[PDB]
Design a protein around this ligand. Structure first.
Ligand code: UC1
Lengths: 405, 531
């Protein structure tokens, strides 16, 4: 049977344009769609339907077989609510998390025949030589927020057995994914997962405890030049927005006179206590920062260069919930966009793992550069939100400072 | 007409059918329409109705050597975008034969969702508004009604599925009232198949056209003439005159701007100059000598035949890009040397501050984006930049940037880095401590410096802004300093520079500083908080 889904009051269906796709990509999608059509999952549609959601194809880390991925971000945002499961604050504590793709379990359930129109999507033709192939869903779509919802009971229903077989293991569900964490060592872990699948199948490596949100560390030297100090002052001065106890008075005094940027200045004991006092303030995360569930989660990223990137997740400015550094993966050496999207997938998963919802990203890339090639390296079932920005020269100089082993 | 499953049409949200009054006409326009409608009435297109229809659309009567649905439409629901992007020659494949069937009034061949038919009611007037008028309605898609192009295509698409299944090696393009049909068969088997399709159509009521109306190669598509083996650019013709109005000069620059794509060398600097301070579209501006000339220098180029070749999937796709000048780029996409599919250029995108490599990055992406639409593939690039300059730049820039598989080609002018701020304070170099200040209200400012070598200066500025003084200070620094300089400033903008090192700006001043930076052997920019 089907349940009556609807749109948030006074909202209309998505009418988002299908961006152009590669041939390789189109061939697969056509291939993939004739099948689901056959299997009755989707049905071609008419011109009297004007809604549309973008689609594309991806190789979910392990393929040759392409996976169909839809961007229901608009639909999701326009779809009524159902007021998922409350976040197991304990998941982020597990020694190791493993993710499972279970969108496959949705086609089973039929979609309200009155909400289907809104799930319309289009397969483009190269050189517009053919009118796009217009389809729509007859079953539950993967990537839509209504799916994991409607399929909740059925889902919860099948996991109890496993849940009751291991209770030292947490099962978290987000969209199409399933986040499974436990403390069993590796072998006893992945054997407990394949074991989990088997069960999961007769129907249809993360380590959170290492995520040491690290500190800021100021440079230490034998002798400091006028320039050395100026740079430090700048950084500290900025950092004073976070730790008001930080002071550069005594240092900004050593900076009296028009001396050579390269000349060396001796640190007064005062400027020394002062510095030493700042080193202390930066020693621990600022007090009072608490996550608000009725507020959006933000993820701002910076390109430090040389394969390096840093990020901060907050809700209120300078009140970071977590900080990190991302280093490119073997292979992405000459691809800024690949490095970036891999970065974003990681952060969004960490975010999900800790707060169970995606953050809205602030990206150091031009909309054009991003939109053109992101899908090329995306591997997640979900798609977070983003906006493109210009990195303030200081924010980068400051975070480039964070500590390393 | 048709045994074709109708499409369910509805009115926009809660609105209701048109009720506009029937425009009054002569005894001559009425008897004309009285003629044509009794015709349609019989063909099975329209249907005489009566007092059971509040709706009404204004029928007019023009003689070609007509019904105004404006309102009915503005009340009709929204359909899916009737194909809005069309093929481009550069992406077409060569065919042996290509026939174009003219499914003209195939509109009046498709049934209109019965229920909706009412809304399309109209009335024939009486001789000077006498007794009741003649009332009718549409049983088929109405020429001019919003939902007809989409509903027609949908239909044509459904109808062709069988044939298309029946012969894959036969490409059929749906467009407007034309079915451009091509193949790689022998002219005989082709001719035979056209008649087969033609008859399939006939099996659904679409009376496809005669020999008289018949269309054949070459075909005019966008700005090209299409031949099945290759295409040619429809020669463009610049008019000659003894009197040029404004419109005259614009419509021209337009045409010329279009040519710039294909044709290389086209210029309109002196031609554009004639629009300066223009009072009215009809004004007559005598062409300067310079304008008379360049106009003459173009006429020539345009008199050059530019033919082209079609897309060959079995061959590679290449793109070469040339920086025609600062901020302008030329590109040509070919598979086999000198046999281009497409070419084109990008107007001097005048940003606020960027550099050549970044600008190259955008041309590259605008292209890639173009390519992916035309070919579902992305070209190999031949770029006038050393792979070192690339690595050197991109690897450090503050923003995610990238360039698909590419290869250098030493086709000057090559794009390079005009300068590079030192990574570390220069030992030895003089150190200018700069400062600019101004009263933002009185716009009166001062800018100057003092160095560790005891050199100082201050200039009083007027009609300036603070950013300008801050920057001027730096300009003076570069002016009064040697080949290697250190510069410390508390300027927020100077901070944007150390991070982006732009080599072109919207600000002439910034430009001057850039010209200075490009001149030094070493420059170190240091920013510091103020006060
Ligand atoms: C779009 C268009 C103008 C089609 C008819 O003109 C030609 C099209 C092709 N090549 C192709 S792939 C083709 C054949 C039928 O429809 C298409 C899109 C080649 C020569 C000409 Cl003259």
């Amino acid at each position: 049977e089907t349940v009556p889904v609807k749109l948030k009051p006074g909202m209309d269906g998505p009418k988002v344009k299908q961006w152009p796709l590669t041939e390789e990509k189109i061939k697969a999608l056509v291939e993939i769609c004739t099948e689901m059509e056959k299997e009755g999952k989707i049905s071609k549609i008419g011109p009297e339907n004007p809604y549309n959601t973008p689609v594309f194809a991806i190789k979910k880390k392990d393929s040759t077989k392409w996976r169909k991925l839809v961007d229901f971000r608009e639909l999701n945002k326009r779809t009524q609510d159902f007021w998922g499961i409350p976040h197991p604050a304990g998941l982020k504590k597990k020694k190791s998390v493993t993710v499972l793709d279970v969108g496959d379990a949705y086609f089973s359930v039929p979609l309200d025949e009155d909400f289907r129109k809104y799930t319309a999507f289009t397969i483009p033709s190269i050189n517009n030589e053919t009118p796009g192939i217009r389809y729509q869903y007859n079953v539950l779509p993967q990537g839509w927020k209504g799916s994991p919802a409607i399929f909740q009971s059925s889902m919860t229903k099948i996991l109890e057995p496993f849940r009751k077989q291991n209770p030292d293991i947490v099962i978290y569900q987000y969209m199409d994914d399933l986040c499974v964490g436990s403390d069993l060592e590796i072998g006893q872990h992945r054997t407990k997962i394949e074991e989990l699948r088997q069960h999961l199948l007769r129907w249809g490596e993360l380590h959170p405890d290492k995520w040491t949100v690290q500190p800021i560390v100021l440079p230490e030297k034998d002798s400091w030049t006028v320039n050395d100090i100026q740079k430090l002052v700048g950084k500290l001065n900025w950092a004073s927005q976070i730790y008001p106890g930080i002071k550069v008075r005594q240092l900004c005094k050593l900076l009296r006179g028009t001396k050579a940027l390269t000349e060396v200045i001796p640190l007064t004991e005062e400027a020394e206590l002062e510095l030493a006092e700042n080193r202390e303030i930066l020693k621990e995360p600022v007090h009072g920062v608490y996550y608000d569930p009725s507020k959006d989660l933000i993820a701002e990223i910076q390109k430090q260069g040389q394969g390096q990137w840093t990020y901060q997740i907050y809700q209120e400015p300078f009140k970071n919930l977590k900080t990190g550094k991302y280093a490119r993966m073997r292979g992405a050496h000459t691809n800024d966009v690949k490095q970036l999207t891999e970065a974003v997938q990681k952060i969004t998963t960490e975010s999900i793992v800790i707060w169970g919802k995606t953050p809205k990203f602030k990206l150091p890339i031009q909309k054009e550069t991003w939109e053109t090639w992101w899908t090329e390296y995306w591997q997640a079932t979900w798609i977070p939100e983003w906006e493109f920005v210009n990195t303030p020269p200081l924010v980068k100089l400051w975070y480039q400072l964070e500590k390393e082993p | 007409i048709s045994p074709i499953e109708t499409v369910p049409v509805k009115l926009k949200p809660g609105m209701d059918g048109p009720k506009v009054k029937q425009w009054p006409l002569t005894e001559e326009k009425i008897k004309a329409l009285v003629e044509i409608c009794t015709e349609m009435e019989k063909e099975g297109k329209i249907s005489k109705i009566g007092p059971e229809n509040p709706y009404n659309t204004p029928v007019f009567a023009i003689k070609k050597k007509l019904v105004d649905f404006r309102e009915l439409n503005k009340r009709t629901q929204d359909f899916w975008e009737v194909q809005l992007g069309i093929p481009h020659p550069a992406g077409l494949k060569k065919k042996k034969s290509v026939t174009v069937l003219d499914v003209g009034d195939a509109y009046f061949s498709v049934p209109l969702d019965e229920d909706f038919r009412k809304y399309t009611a109209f009335t024939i007037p009486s001789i000077n508004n006498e007794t009741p008028g003649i009332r009718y309605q549409y049983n088929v898609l109405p020429q001019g009604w919003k939902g007809s192009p989409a509903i027609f295509q949908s239909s044509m698409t459904k109808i062709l599925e069988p044939f298309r299944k029946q012969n894959p090696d036969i490409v059929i393009y749906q467009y407007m009232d034309d079915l451009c049909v091509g193949s790689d068969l022998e002219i005989g088997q082709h001719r035979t198949k056209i008649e087969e399709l033609r008859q399939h159509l006939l099996r659904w009521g679409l009376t496809t056209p005669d020999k008289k109306h018949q269309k054949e190669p070459p075909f005019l598509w966008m700005g090209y003439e299409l031949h099945p083996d290759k295409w040619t650019v429809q020669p463009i013709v610049l008019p000659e005159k003894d009197s040029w109005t404004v419109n005259d000069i614009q419509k021209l620059v337009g045409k010329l701007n279009w040519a710039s794509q294909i044709y290389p060398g086209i210029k309109v600097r002196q031609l554009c100059k004639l629009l300066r301070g223009t009072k009215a579209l009809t004004e007559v501006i005598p062409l300067t000598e310079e304008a008379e000339l360049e106009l003459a220098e173009n006429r020539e180029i345009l008199k050059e035949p530019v033919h082209g070749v079609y897309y060959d999937p079995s061959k590679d796709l290449i793109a070469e890009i040339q920086k025609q000048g600062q901020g302008q780029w030329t590109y040509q996409i070919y598979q086999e040397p000198f046999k281009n599919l497409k070419t084109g250029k990008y107007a001097r995108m005048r940003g606020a501050h960027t550099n050549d490599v970044k600008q190259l990055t955008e041309a590259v992406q605008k292209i890639t984006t173009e390519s992916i639409v035309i070919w579902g593939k992305t070209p190999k690039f031949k770029l006038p930049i050393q792979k070192e300059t690339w690595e050197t730049w991109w690897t450090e820039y503050w923003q995610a940037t990238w360039i698909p598989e590419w290869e250098f080609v030493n086709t000057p002018p090559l794009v390079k880095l005009w300068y590079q701020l030192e990574k570390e304070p220069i030992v030895g170099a003089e150190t200018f401590y700069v400062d600019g200040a101004a009263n933002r209200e009185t716009k009166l400012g001062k800018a100057g410096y003092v160095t560790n070598r005891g050199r100082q200066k201050v200039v009083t500025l007027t009609d300036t802004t603070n950013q300008k003084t801050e920057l001027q200070a730096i300009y003076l620094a570069l002016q009064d300093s040697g080949l290697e300089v250190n510069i410390v400033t508390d300027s927020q903008y100077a901070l944007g520079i150390i991070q982006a090192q732009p080599d072109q700006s919207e600000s002439e001043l910034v430009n001057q500083i850039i010209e200075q930076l490009i001149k030094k052997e070493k420059v170190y920019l240091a920013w510091v908080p103020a006060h």
